[PDB]
Chain A
Amino acid sequence: LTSARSRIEDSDYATEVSNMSRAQILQQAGTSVLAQANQVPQNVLSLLR
């Protein structure tokens, strides 16, 4: 019964570590692309005159 409960409940560290890595990376890349996106409109400002 202990083994059965382990199966139903216990997580897998390997899988979860890979997941965390993927998440951290998506987050960092998102921050970067946001930095690039914020700039976009300012190309307009050059046409201020």
Chain B
Amino acid sequence: SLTKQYLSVSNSIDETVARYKAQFTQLDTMMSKLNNTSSYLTQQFTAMNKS
């Protein structure tokens, strides 16, 4: 009953932790994309201004 409730709450908590971490992972992938794009945009500006 009590250690049982612990089993249940541990399980539920674990589900929640996986959820949070997964959200963070996807968000960071989006970050990767945008960072790369903006970085090459920046180099292009620097060169074409050096022009």
Contacts and interface: CB of A to CB of B under 8 A. Distances in A.
Interface of A: 13-14, 17
6 contacts: A13-B41, A13-B44, A13-B45, A14-B44, A17-B45, A17-B48
Interface of B: 41, 44-45, 48
Summarize B's interface: helix, strand, loop or mixed: helix
Nearest to B45: A13
Contacts, number: 6
B42 to A, nearest CB: 10
Contacts of A17: 45, 48
Contacts of B41: 13
A13 B41 CA distance: 8
B34 to A, nearest CB: 10
Nearest to A20: B48
A14 B43 CA distance: 12
| B41, B44, B45, B48: residue with the most chain A Cβ atoms closer than 10 Å | B48
